[PDB]
Design a protein around this ligand. Structure first.
Ligand SMILES: NC(=O)c1ccc[n+]([C@@H]2O[C@H](COP(=O)([O-])OP(=O)(O)OC[C@H]3O[C@@H](n4cnc5c(N)ncnc54)[C@H](O)[C@@H]3O)[C@@H](O)[C@H]2O)c1
Ligand SMILES: NC(=O)c1ccc[n+]([C@@H]2O[C@H](COP(=O)([O-])OP(=O)(O)OC[C@H]3O[C@@H](n4cnc5c(N)ncnc54)[C@H](O)[C@@H]3O)[C@@H](O)[C@H]2O)c1
Ligand SMILES: NC(=O)c1ccc[n+]([C@@H]2O[C@H](COP(=O)([O-])OP(=O)(O)OC[C@H]3O[C@@H](n4cnc5c(N)ncnc54)[C@H](O)[C@@H]3O)[C@@H](O)[C@H]2O)c1
Ligand SMILES: NC(=O)c1ccc[n+]([C@@H]2O[C@H](COP(=O)([O-])OP(=O)(O)OC[C@H]3O[C@@H](n4cnc5c(N)ncnc54)[C@H](O)[C@@H]3O)[C@@H](O)[C@H]2O)c1
Lengths: 468, 468, 468, 468
C-alpha cells in the first residue's frame, strides 16, 4: 500500500532497524526527550519537512519527532551522506523519505521539492534544515513568484543551474501562489549548521526572512561538541575508509581553525599526522600556534603535505594551482558543508579513474595524480558514517527542542521573523541528559556555594556571554 | 637628580634592566606595539596612573606606554608581588614608582594616593588598574567630598579601616575639591581583573561611575592567556618546584573545568597524571568527559587521588572531611580564588611542619599527613613564577590598546560614563601583534572570498557571539 | 583459461589492481627490493607456499616474490582476513590463491592443504607463514606418518577436530611418505608473528623442527613498527567500522601490554577512550602505569568497561564469567592471533543476532547483550583492512629478505634446523628504504664522531641487544 | 664524618632531612630493599666509594647502602648536580661527602681523589659510579704507575689537563704502588649511565679492566624508565627553572632519539613545543618519524628552532657554526652526560653575561645572543633537581642489588674481569617492588595459561632478547 518514498533498497530495512536499535542506547538525550515529551504530544499537528543527512542517527531523530506527534516528510541534505539502511527503515516505518546514497544533483533538488507536497494535500508547517537548501527553495520560489524572476536566468554553477531550473519548473507546474501558500504555512525553521545559519542571518538582515528561525548550531551543546568532537572522530574515519593510508609519518594540512577545523586538526594529530593549519582570522591562528600547529599558507603547504582537508565554510580554498603543485598521490578532501571549497570543476577536463565509491584518482598532464574523496563533498559522511550517535544525540536533542519552541511555544509571538537561539537553561538540560550514560557524576552546589558565585543551584551556571 | 620614587634599593636597577631586556624578547606584542604605534605618539599628553603588580613584565608595559608618549606614575596592586629589581629599574629610568615587596597595607594605600600627585601639580588623566583600588580611591573620595561622609566611619575590616583613614587624610591634606578635580580630568580607566570589573559594573548600574571604563578582562586574547594558557604553563611548574614529585603514574583531581580548570587538567595530563575532574555545570562536565577525564565528586576522589587542585572560584571545595580521608602525603593546592577553596582554617589545631617556603606538611591524629602548597593560596604564584612573559604580553597589549582607545579615540564621545569592552578588531589586533614571533603566517582573503562569508578582508572575522 | 584458484568473485580483480597500484606507492621497501634484486632473480626455482592474510598489502608482497623469480601458491591465515578484491587480483594474475573472506574452518584447512599440491605434481620448497598453521600441517602429518597417530583422536576444539580430520584424510589420499617428501623439499620457513614464532621455538627446543626457520617478528623493523604502530592505526579502525561507536567518553580495557597491547592501548587512547590495562608481567605493568594507564584485573574491569580488547596471545583471558558481568552492549574483541583469548565456544548456547558481517549481538538469559566483533578473530583484519600499507612494507621487506636468505644464501648450511633472526645490517637497511617516502633527513656521522662512539659511519649503530 | 666532609652549608641538614623523608615515601624499591636486606647485612665489610650526583634521591641510596652494613665515602659526579641540603644531611649523618653545587673542575677532581683515602687507613673495596670518572682515576693511575706516563703530558681539554695534573700529584704524594693497591682491593664497580658503560666495555675489550663490573644502565627497569620517563619529567623542569619561557608553540630541536632523546622529545612535546629531532641511526629516525616528529639536520634546525637539546652521548653536535646561525636568544642545553656535545670551549672568546646560577647569555660579534644552560652540562640536574624520586628508586634498587652481587655473591668467581648485566629475575623483582605504590594490580597466570605461553607462573615472563 505505502509507496510514497524513494530509497535504494527497501530490503535493507531490517539491517537499518538493528543499527537504529543500537544507536538508541547511545542517544540518551533523544530517548529521554521521548519519555518526557511523549505524554505531552507537543508536535501533534506538526507537519515537518526535514532536510538532513539520512543516517541511522537521523532515523532516531525522525522517530523522536514522530513519537512527539509529528507527521513527517524527509530528504538528505547531501547527495553522498545517506545511509541506505537507515532510509529503508524510515520508509518501512511508513514515513515518506527521498534519499539515496549517490543520488544525482538533479535528483537531490527534485527530492527537496517533494518535501512540500504533503500527503492528502497541502504543505508542511515546519522545516528542520541542515545547510538551508529547503529554506532556500521556499525563499527563492517566493521571490520569483512575487515578480523578481531575473536571478533564475543567470546561473553560475552546475548545481545552481539545476536549482534554477527546478524553481522555474515549480512556478510553471504548481498552482499560482504556491510559494506564498507554503510561506504562510511554515511556522518556523530550525537550522543545524554553520553555513545554513549564515544564510539565515543574511535573509534576516535584508528583511527577506519569511518565518521565525532558531539557530541550533550555536547551542554550546551543538557547536562545541558536534562540530568539534564529532569531526575529531569522523574525519580520520572517512580518510581511512577511503584510502587505508598510514597516517603516522604523514603531513596533513587543514584549512580553517574554527570549530570544525579544531576538530579536524585534532582528528589527524591523534591519528599520528604532523598537522599544519591555514587561517585568515588572527585569533584562531594564534589558538592553532598555541597548540603547536604550524600555521602556513596553502601555497606553502601545497607541494609538501600528504593530506589536505578544507574546513572553512568558504570557497576556492584549494585551487587548480595548488593541485598542480601537489605531490603524486596526495589525498584531498573537504569537511565543510559544500564542495566549492575545492575547485572540483577545474579538474573535469583531466583524466579521472574511479577507484571505488567516493574515491577517484585524477591525473594531470605531467602524470602526477591526486586522490579525491567524495568528489569534494563532506568526507566524513561521504566516505564513512558521519559523527557517532552519542554526539549526534546532543545536536538532535537541540533540534527537537527547537521544533517544540517554534511549533508549540509561540502562542504569544515571542518568536518573530528573526533568528533566535535556545536559552541557556535548555542548552544545559541537553548536556545533563547525556551525563549518566558516560558515567559522569555531577557535583551539586550547596545553597551557600550557589549564592557565593551568584547562581541558582539548578542553573543556569554561566552568563550568556560565556565562551566555554 | 631624580628622587620621586620609593623602592627597596635603587642599586638593584642594573639587575632589573638585564631581566627586563630578556623579557622584551618574550613580549613581542608589546615590542611590536612600540614599533607600530611609536611613530604617531598616540599617548603624547597622557598622564597615566597605573596600579599593577610591579614585576619585570609590568616594567615592559610601562616602558611601552612611555615609548608611545605617556607620562607615568606607578604602584603595585599587591603588597607582595613587587619584584624589587623591576621597581628599581623603573625608578632609575626616571619614572615615579612607589612599590616595595612586602610593604605594609598602610604603605600600600599611601603609595596608591601618590599616583595622583602629578609632577608640576596636576592630576593624572588616565588610570590603568588591576583590581580597582585606584579607581575606588577616586570614587570614595568624591562621594565623601560631595558631602556623604558617614560610610568612612563604618569600616568592615582592618584593611577597610586603613582605606577609610586614607580618604579622611586626603580630605584634610589635599585642597577642597581635589577628588572632583581628579574625576573631571580622568579620561578613562582600563581594568584587567574580575574583581575590578565587578566594581565598575556596580558603579555604572548605580549611576556613580565618574568616567568611561574599558573591561580588558573580557577580550578573547586576554581571557584565554590569563586563564587558560597561563595556568597550563605554570601549574605543574609550581607542583614540581614545591615537591619534586614524579607525576607519571599519579592520579590528580581538579575541581572545576572552566578556563583555569581546563588549563590545569591539561597541565597535569601533559605531565603524565591520570586526571579526574569535578564540576557542577553539566556543560563543562560533558566537556571534561569528552576529553577523557573521569568526572567524579570530591568525596569519591578524596581517598584516591595523589594530588588535588582547586580551580573553581567557589568556596569550601576541599573540606576537613576530605582531608581526613586523603592518603598519606597527598599533595593539596589551589590555583583558583585567592583563598578559601580549601578549608585551611579547619587545620589550625593540627601539627604543621614547614618543609620550605610555601610547602608545609600537616599531620592528623591518625598520623596520615598531607602536603599543602602555599598555605592554600595560589600555587602558580607561591611555588613557581606566575604566568610566563609571552602570556602577560597578551594581557598587557590589550591594556595598551585600551589606553589608546580612551585617551586618543574618544574625540566624538563614543565612550560615555559606562563600561565597554574592546571591539573585536582590537582583540584581533592583539593576536596579530604576536603572530610574527610565534612564526605564524596568516592567509589574506581575496575579495570574492570575503564577500562569500560576509566579512571585510580586514575583519572583524567573527560575530560578537562567536565563542572560539 | 587459468582456473587454479578459489576466490569470492574474480570480477573484483580490476578493483583489486587499482588498490594494489595505490599500495605500491606506499610500500617503498618492497618496491626498492624489486629494483635491487629483480635483475639477479634470487628466487628463480623457489616454490613458495604462503599462508598470510590475503590483503592488498600481501598482494604487493606476492608480486614482489614473483618479480624475484618465485613460483607461488597462497592462502589466507585467517577465515575473515581476506580482502576479496586482493585475492581476485592475484588469481587474475595467474597465481594460485585459495582465500575467501568468511570461508568456513573446514574450507580454511582444505585450502591450507592445497598449498602443498604443486602444479604439475610435487611440493613447495619454501614456506612463508604467519601464525604457523602451514608449518604445523607439515609437522603434524610427519609425526603421524612416522607412526605416532594417537594425538589425532583427542581434539580440544572444533578447529582441532577439523585439523586432525584433515591430517587423517591426507594420510589416506596422498602417497605413502608424502609428509616426509614435503619435509625433505622445504628449504626453509620464514615466520611473521609472535604466536607462530613461539610455535617454532617449541619445536626447535623439542628437536622436532624439520627445516631452517627465520623469525621475522623479532626484526626491530617488524616488532617495534608493525605490532606497535600497525595496531595503533588499525584497532580503532576495526571497532569504528563494526560499531560506529563514539569513543570519546568511553572506558576501554586492553588485556596485555606487550607490543600489540601497547599499540592497542594507544589506538584507543588516541581515539579518546579512558584506557585500562591488565598484565601478568611486572615490567610491562610498570610501563603501562608510567604511561598513565590504570592497571587492573579483568574481574575489576568486567562490569565497568565499555570496550574490551584482548592482546595477549594467551588463552581464556575473557571468560563466560566476565561476559555475564558486562554492561549491556559492551563491545568485545580480540587482536591477538587466535580466537581462544575469548571463550567464544561458551557462548554458543546463547541467542546470537547477526547485525552485519563480523558483527553479532549476543543476548544472555537476564537480557543483557554484548557486541562481539569477528567472532573473536583478529578484529583489525576482520572488521577493517588490517595495518596500512606503509608499515606492512617494513614487515614484508623483512619477509622477502628472509626468503632470499633461506632459498639463495644457504649453500654453506649456515642455516641449520634451528630458528634464526635477520642481522642488524639488514634491519637497518629496511628502515633506510622507508626514510625518503616520509621526508626524513638522516644525519651522517663525521668520521671523528663515528670513531668517538665506536661505530662505522655506515653502521650498524647499535649493539645486538639494544632495545630501541 | 664528625669533621671529614666538604659541603656548602652544613646548616641545611634539617631541610635535607625533611626532603629525604619525603623522598623515602616515593622510593618503595629502596625502602623494600632496606627492609629485606637490612637484617642480613650483606654489605657488612664493604667500603664503597660512590661517585654519583649528590641529590636527595642519592641520599636515600646512600642511607640504604649504610642500612645494609656499608661504610661509605661519596662525591658528586658532576660539578652542578649536587643539592646542597642533600649533601649536608649526609654529612650530618656522619658519612664523608665532598660535594658542592658549583664546585670547580679542580675541586671536582680533588674531591674524587678523597674517595680513595679511607678513614682509619686503607682504600675502598667497591665502587659505585655514574659516568666512569672514579673508575677512570684508578685505571689511569694504574697505567701511569706501571710506567706508561707519556699520555699525562698530552691533554685534549681543560678538564683532561686538570685530571692529568691530579694523577701526577697522586703519583708524587702517595706511597709507591698506591694505584696497584687500590686496584687489588676493589671487588667490583657498578655503573649507572650509558656513557660510563661504553667506557667499561672498551676497557674490557682491550683487556685493561681491572675488576668485575655490572652494567646497571642496561637493566630494563633502568634504561626504559630512568633514561626515558626521567628525562620526560626533568628536561622541561630544567628549561623552565632556568628561563621561565612560555613553551607552547616554541619549536625545539632534540639531537638523538635513543632512550634519553625519546624522553627529551616527549618532555618538550608534552609542554606544548613543536619538536624536531636529528638522528644518524635509520631505525631510531624512523621511530621518530612514526611518532610524528620532523626529522631534520642540525644545519636545517639551527636558524629556526627556539630551543636546542643535545641527547646523543656523542661530541660536536652543536658547533660554533650552528650557534652563529641561531636566532637571537635561542636556548641551548645538553642532557647527555658530558659538556662536549656542545662546543662550549669555542664560545670562550665571546662575551658571557651571567643571568643567574647555571644561566648565561653569550653575545656574538653581530650582536645576536644565545642562552646557555649549565655551561653545557646536564641541564636536568644543573638547572633543576634531576629525575624525580620514584623513577630513581628503580635505578638505585638496581645499583644496590648490583653492589650486593659483586660484594657478597662472587665467592665462586661467577663475575670475572668483564662487564655483566643483572638477570631478568632481578629486573622483574625491581618492577614488582614499585607496583603497589603506583596502584598497579598484577594479574596472576593460571598454571594452564603459564604452560600455554611457555613461562613459569612466577616468571621470568620474557626471553632475554625481548625489547619491551
Ligand atoms: N560533519 C561536518 O562535516 C560538519 C559539521 C559541522 C559544520 N560543518 C561545516 O563546516 C564548515 C565550517 O564550520 P565551522 O563551525 O567550523 O565554522 P567557523 O566559523 O567556526 O570556522 C571556519 C573558519 O574558517 C576560517 N576561514 C575562512 N576563510 C578561510 C580561508 N580562505 N583560509 C583559511 N581559513 C579560512 C575562518 O576564519 C574560521 O575560523 C561549515 O561549512 C559548516 O557548516 C560540517
Ligand atoms: N591562579 C591564577 O593565576 C589565576 C588566573 C586566572 C584566574 N584565576 C582564578 O581562577 C578561578 C576560576 O577562574 P575561571 O576563569 O576558570 O572561572 P570559570 O567561571 O570559567 O570556571 C569555574 C568553574 O568552576 C565550576 N564550579 C563552581 N563551583 C564548583 C564546585 N563546588 N565544584 C566543582 N566545580 C565548581 C563552575 O561550574 C565553573 O565551570 C577564579 O577565581 C579566577 O579568578 C586564577
Ligand atoms: N592483529 C595484528 O595485526 C597482530 C599484529 C602482531 C601480532 N599479533 C599477535 O598479537 C599477540 C600478541 O603479540 P605481542 O607481540 O604483543 O606479544 P608480547 O609477548 O610482546 O605481548 C604479550 C603480553 O601479554 C601478556 N600476557 C600474557 N598472558 C596474560 C594474561 N593472562 N593477562 C594479561 N596479560 C597477559 C604478556 O605478559 C605480554 O606482555 C600474538 O598472538 C601475536 O601473534 C597480532
Ligand atoms: N641527563 C640524564 O639524567 C641522563 C640519564 C640517562 C642517560 N644520560 C646520558 O645521555 C646520553 C645518551 O644516552 P642514551 O641512553 O639515550 O644513549 P642511546 O645510545 O640510547 O641513544 C643515543 C642516540 O644518539 C644518536 N646519535 C649519535 N650521534 C648522533 C649525532 N651526531 N646526531 C644525532 N644523533 C646522534 C644515536 O644514534 C643514538 O640513537 C649518554 O651520555 C647518557 O649517559 C643522561
Amino acid at each position: 500500500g505505502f509507496t510514497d518514498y524513494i530509497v535504494k533498497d527497501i530490503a535493507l530495512a531490517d539491517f537499518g532497524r538493528k543499527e537504529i536499535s543500537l544507536a538508541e542506547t547511545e542517544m540518551p538525550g533523544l530517548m529521554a526527550t521521548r519519555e518526557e515529551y511523549g505524554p505531552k504530544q507537543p508536535l501533534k499537528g506538526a507537519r515537518i519537512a526535514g532536510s538532513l543527512h539520512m543516517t541511522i542517527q537521523t532515523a532516531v531523530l525522525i522517530e523522536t519527532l514522530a513519537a512527539l506527534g509529528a507527521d513527517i516528510r524527509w530528504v538528505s541534505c547531501n547527495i553522498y551522506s545517506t545511509q541506505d539502511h537507515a532510509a529503508a527503515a524510515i520508509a518501512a516505518a511508513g514515513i515518506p523519505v527521498f534519499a539515496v546514497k549517490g543520488e544525482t544533483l538533479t535528483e537531490y533538488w527534485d527530492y527537496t521539492a517533494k518535501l512540500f507536497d504533503w500527503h492528502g494535500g497541502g504543505t508542511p508547517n515546519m522545516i528542520l534544515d541542515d545547510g538551508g537548501d529547503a529554506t532556500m527553495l521556499v525563499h527563492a520560489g517566493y521571490r520569483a513568484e512575487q515578480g523578481d524572476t531575473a536571478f533564475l536566468d543567470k546561473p553560475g554553477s552546475e548545481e545552481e543551474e539545476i536549482f534554477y531550473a527546478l524553481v522555474k519548473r515549480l512556478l510553471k507546474e504548481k498552482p499560482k501562489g504556491w510559494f506564498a501558500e507554503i510561506a504562510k504555512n511554515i511556522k518556523g525553521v530550525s537550522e543545524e549548521t554553520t553555513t545554513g545559519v549564515h544564510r539565515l542571518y543574511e535573509m534576516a538582515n535584508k528583511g527577506t526572512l519569511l518565518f521565525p528561525a532558531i539557530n541550533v548550531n550555536d547551542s554550546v551543546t551543538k557547536s562545541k561538541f558536534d562540530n568539534l568532537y564529532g569531526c575529531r572522530e569522523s574525519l580520520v574515519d572517512g580518510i581511512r575508509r577511503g584510502t587505508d593510508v598510514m597516517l603516522s609519518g604523514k603531513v596533513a594540512m587543514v584549512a580553517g581553525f574554527g570549530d570544525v577545523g579544531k576538530g579536524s586538526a585534532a582528528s589527524l594529530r591523534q591519528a599520528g599526522c604532523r598537522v599544519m593549519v591555514s587561517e585568515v582570522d588572527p585569533i584562531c591562528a594564534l589558538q592553532a600556534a598555541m597548540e603547536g600547529y604550524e600555521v602556513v599558507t596553502m601555497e606553502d603547504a601545497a607541494p609538501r603535505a600528504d593530506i589536505f582537508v578544507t574546513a572553512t565554510g568558504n570557497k576556492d580554498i584549494i585551487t587548480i594551482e595548488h593541485m598542480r603543485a601537489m605531490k603524486d598521490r596526495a589525498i584531498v578532501c573537504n569537511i565543510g558543508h559544500f564542495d566549492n571549497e575545492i575547485q572540483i570543476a577545474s579538474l573535469r577536463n583531466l583524466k579521472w579513474t574511479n577507484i571505488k565509491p567516493q574515491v577517484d584518482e585524477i591525473e594531470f598532464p605531467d602524470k602526477h595524480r591526486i586522490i579525491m574523496l567524495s568528489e569534494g563533498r563532506l568526507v566524513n559522511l561521504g566516505n564513512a558514517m558521519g559523527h557517532p550517535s552519542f554526539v549526534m544525540s546532543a545536536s538532535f536533542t537541540n533540534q527537537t527542542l527547537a521544533q517544540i519552541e517554534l511549533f508549540a511555544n509561540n502562542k504569544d509571538s515571542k518568536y518573530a521573523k528573526k533568528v533566535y537561539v535556545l536559552p541557556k537553561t535548555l542548552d544545559e538540560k541537553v548536556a545533563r541528559l547525556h551525563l549518566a550514560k558516560i558515567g559522569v557524576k555531577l557535583t551539586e552546589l550547596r545553597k551557600d556555594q550557589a549564592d557565593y558565585i551568584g547562581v541558582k543551584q539548578e542553573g543556569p551556571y554561566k552568563s550568556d556571554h560565556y565562551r566555554y
